[PDB]
Design a protein around this nucleic acid. Sequence first.
RNA 1: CGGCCGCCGAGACCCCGGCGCACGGACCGAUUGGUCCGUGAUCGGGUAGGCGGGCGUGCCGGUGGCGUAGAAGCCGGGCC
RNA 2: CAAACUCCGAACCCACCGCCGCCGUAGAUGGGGGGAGUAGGGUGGCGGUGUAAGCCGUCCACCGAGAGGGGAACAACCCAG
RNA 3: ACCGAUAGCGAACUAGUACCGUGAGGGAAAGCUGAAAAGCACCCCGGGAGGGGGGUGAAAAGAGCCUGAAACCGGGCGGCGAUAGGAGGGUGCGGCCCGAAAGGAAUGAGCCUCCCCGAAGGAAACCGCGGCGACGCGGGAGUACGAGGGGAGGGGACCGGGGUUGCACCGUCCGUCUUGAAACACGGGGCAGGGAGUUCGCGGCCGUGGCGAGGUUAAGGGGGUUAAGCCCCGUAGCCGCAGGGAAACCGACAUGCCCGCAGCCGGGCUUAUGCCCGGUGAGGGGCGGGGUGCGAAAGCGCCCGGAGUCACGGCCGCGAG
RNA 4: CUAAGCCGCCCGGUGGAUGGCUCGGCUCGGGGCGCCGACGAAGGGCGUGGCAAGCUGCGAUAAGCCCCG
Lengths: 120, 147, 128, 92
Amino acid sequence: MKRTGPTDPNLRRLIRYLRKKSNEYGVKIWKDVAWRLERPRRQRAEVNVSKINRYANDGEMIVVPGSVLGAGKLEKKVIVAAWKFSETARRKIIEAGGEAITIEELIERNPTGSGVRIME
Amino acid sequence: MIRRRKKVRKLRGSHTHGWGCKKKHRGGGSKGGRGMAGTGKRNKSKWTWTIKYAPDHLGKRGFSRPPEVQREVRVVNLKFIDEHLDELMQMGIAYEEGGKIIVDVTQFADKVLGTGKLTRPLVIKARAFSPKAEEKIKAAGGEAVLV
Amino acid sequence: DEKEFKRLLRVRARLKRKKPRFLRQEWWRYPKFKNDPKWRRPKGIDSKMRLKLKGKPRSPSIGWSSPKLVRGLHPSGYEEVLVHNVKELEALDPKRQAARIAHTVGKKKRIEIIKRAEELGIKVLNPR
Amino acid sequence: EIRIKEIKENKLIGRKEIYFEIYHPGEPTPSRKDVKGKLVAMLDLNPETTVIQYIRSYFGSYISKGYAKAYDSKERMLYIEPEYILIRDGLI
RNA sequence: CGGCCGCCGAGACCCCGGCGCACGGACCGAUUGGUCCGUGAUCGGGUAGGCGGGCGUGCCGGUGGCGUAGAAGCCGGGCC
RNA sequence: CAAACUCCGAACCCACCGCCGCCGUAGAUGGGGGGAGUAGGGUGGCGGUGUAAGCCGUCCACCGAGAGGGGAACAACCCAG
RNA sequence: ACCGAUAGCGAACUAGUACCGUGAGGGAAAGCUGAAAAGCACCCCGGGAGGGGGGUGAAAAGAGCCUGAAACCGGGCGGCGAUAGGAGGGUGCGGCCCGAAAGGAAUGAGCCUCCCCGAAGGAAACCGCGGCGACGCGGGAGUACGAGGGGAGGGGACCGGGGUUGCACCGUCCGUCUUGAAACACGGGGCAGGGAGUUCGCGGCCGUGGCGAGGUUAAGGGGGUUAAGCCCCGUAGCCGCAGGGAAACCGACAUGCCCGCAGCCGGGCUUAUGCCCGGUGAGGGGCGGGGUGCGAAAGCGCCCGGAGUCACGGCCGCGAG
RNA sequence: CUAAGCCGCCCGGUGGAUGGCUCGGCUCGGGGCGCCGACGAAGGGCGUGGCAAGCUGCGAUAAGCCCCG
C-alpha cells in the first residue's frame, strides 16, 4: 500500500529541518539522513554498540538514522547521534566516555557535518 | 497509528468485488476441493502446488522418543557469559571469593559452548564443556572447573 | 493581479456556461430518475454512453475543471463564508470575503448580523 | 500581503500574540525569514525578540494563516519558549 | 483506361487559454499533507484486475454553534 | 517425378562480438514481497486437412477491452488511436 | 458507540389473537387530533349520506384527525396540436411564454460606433510571364482579415437562467451470458420502502507506534468509582537469543580478506549547480574459515560475524452457513 | 378563440413514504431469587360487571370477602 511516512510530528519536523539545513549549507549529508529517516518503519535502521566499536575510530562523530541498541561491548570514545537510544546503549556509551546526543545537537555542533559518518 | 477503511467500502459499486466473472466464487468447486483436499493422495488438483510449496506433506519420517525420557540440556556461550558478567555479579551468580573471579553457571545452563572470544581471566563452573570452549578458556588464562 | 483575475473570471464564466448538466443514462425515461436527478457512471457491457458514441450525452472529465485562481468563488468574484452569528461575521475580510447567513438563522439574529455587517462594510449575499 | 486579524497583549506572561493572514495568490508559501522580516518591518518590532510560532497553508486557498509571538525580553523566552522552537528560529 | 489541375473534407497535425497526472525543486503544515515553480515530440481511450484521493448516511468522545422572530422533514427555483 | 529423396540451395531466422540509435543515477537490466484476473476467444495472412463450408495450428496486426471521419448500413476493411 | 413501527422478539395494540389444515401443525395485519374537546351552538338545502353559511381553536390539526412525498387521476394555466417516421435523446440556434429573492446589472444589460496590439493561418483588384487547357509563377503581401487581449464614445434595462415547441445534422433502449446483442436470446407496467464480503480461530504480508537481547502478558488480585470506565501488581505461559539429525547425540566468525553504492575527505574543470579523479567506506555482494548429517576421506545439504517481540489498522489463504 | 393527445407549473383527489416521537424489543460485566403437586399441581372448559362483546382479573362469597401494618 501507500507509504504514509512517520506519524511523529517531531520526526517530520526534524526531516524538514534537515532538508532546509542541507540547502542552507550546501551539503548532502543532511538530505541523505532525511531520506534514510523517511524509509519505511519496518525497515528503519538498527545499529548496535558492537558495530559502532567495530567500525568507528576514537573521537569520531556518528549519526544513526534510527535506533541504537546496547548489544555488545564498546571501548571507543565516539560522539553518536541517533533518533532513539536504548538505556543500555546510552549507559554503555557514557561509561566508555562518549556522548549520546540527537541529530539536532549534532547539527548545532557541526553545521557543515564534516567528518560525520552514517551508520545503518 | 494509521487506520484505513475496508476495501468493501470502495468496492460498493463494483458489481463483482474483484472476483472477475460472476460465475466464480461459488464454493468447493471454486476452490477445487474443500480444505487440504487434492494434495496428492487421491486427487491431484493441487499436486503441482504440493510438490513445490509444501514438500513432504504426504509420507512419514522417523520416530520420536517419549517426552518423559527426553532430558533437556540448557546451553550457554562464552560470549554470553563475558557480555553479561556484570548482571551475573548483581544476581550473585558471580563473586570474587579471593583473587580469582568465580562464576557458577551450574544454576543456569548445563553445557558451555565455545562461541565468540574470552577477554578477562574468569573461572566458570559447569557440568560439560566443548573442546573449543575449554581451549579458549585456557588460552584466555581462566580455569574450567569440571564439577 | 486584477487583470488576470478578471480574465480568468470571464474564462470560468464561459466554460461553466457551456458546461452541461451531467445526468445518468435514461434519466428522462423513468420518474424514479427524474425526481432525483444525479449522474452515475455507465458500466454496462453494451452501454452506448460508456462507449462514448456521438449523439449521446457526455460524461464528466477532469478537463472541465475551472481555473485554479477563481475556483469556488462567487460569480461576483468574492469568496463565500457561511456565517451563523456576529462573532464569525466579524472575522471576515471585507476586501476579499462575503458573508452568507445560514438558512437556519432567525430574523432576530439576522437583523443584528445585517446591521453589524453594514457597520463593518462587509458585503452580504442574502441581506434578508 | 500580510493582514493582521488579531493582536493580544499579556503582560502576566509578558508577550504579544499576533494572528494574521498572508494573501499570496500565484506565489508559494513565503519563507519564515521573509514573513518575520515583513512583520517586524511593519510593526516596528524588535527582530531579535520575536518568533513565528507557525505558518499554515490549507488546500488550494492562497490565504495562509500565521501565528507569531513578540516578547519584551530574552529572559521570558528563555523561561517559556522550548529549546527546539528557539533553535528553529535561530535566535539563540 | 494513361495522366493532370483546383476545391472540399476528422477529436488527426499546428496555435491560444485551462485542468489533471508522472518526475525534480523551493518554501510551509503538531497523523497520510499544503502553495508555487521546472520538463513532458518521447503524459491524458479502456473490459477483468491492482493502486491513490474524494462525496454521502446512523451513532459515540470532543470542539464551535443554530432554533417557536420557527428545527427536522416535504414542493418549485438561484449559485458553487 | 517425390511430405515421409537430395550432388546442390536462397530469401530468411537464430546465437555471439564491435559500433550507430534508443533507454538508464529524476535509478534501467536485475532481485524480494502483497493482490489478482485469465484455462470457450473472433477477423485477417500462412501451413496441414476437407468437394466446399468448416476443423486444427501458426503470425500479434484489428474487435474482445476502442472514441472520431468514410466504405449505404457492416466488429474485423481505409484514415485514426 | 444496538433498533426506532416493512426496523426491534412472531406480537410497542382486545398476539401465539384473528384466520388455514381431519391431523401432526402453520400463523398475520394493526402506533400518533389538540395545550384544553374547547369534538362545530344556530340558519338554508337534501329521503338520507352529507353540502353551503356561521362558530371553536395560535394553527382544522374536523375524529376518514402530527407531517402528507412518489406512482396515478381531474381542472386551470403556458407550448405544440388532424401531410407526417423513428429507442422518444445529443449539438446549435429561432418562435410563444415565465422571469421579486437567491445570479450579474443604473458604480451600467443586451445593443450601436470608433481606436490599438495580435498566435497558428491567410486572400483579392491590378501588372508581367509559362501552359493546348483546367491553371500556375513573381510583385501587390505575409497586406485586408484573424482566436484573444485592451481602451474611448452614445443609449439607458436587460442578460444569464427556465417550460414547451420548430428547423439542420446526428443517434437502432437498460442489465446479463457470449467471439459476437437493437436482436426473432434471457431479466425489464409504474412508484415508495427493505436487500446481498459478516464474526471467530490459525497463518503469510505490508502502514505505523512502544521496548529492545530482550519482548509481552493470560487467568486472576488489590485501590478507586454511581458504574464494567481509571491506577498498580500478576513471569505461569508464548516467541527470540544456535543450528544440524529419524535418533543417540554433537555443537559455530563479538570480522581473516577482496570488490563496493550512499555519505565523508583531498584535487581539477565548472559563474554556480554539476561532472571527473584518488582515498575511507556503514548497509550490500563475494571469498576464507567454523558447527552438524551422509562418509574411509574428499566433497556436498542446512546453518554461523546479535534483531526480535507486542500492539492498532488493512490485503489475502484455510475451516466454519 | 381547433376536437382528442403529449410534456411542464399551480391547485385538488388517492395513498401512506419521509421527518420527529416511544409505557415495546434486543444485548450485557456485576448483583438478587430459583422448584410447584393427593393438605389435589401446571395446562384447559365454563361461568362472573347495572348498562359488558375482547383482553385482564376473579370462582356460585365470582374486576371480589376478612385481619394486622
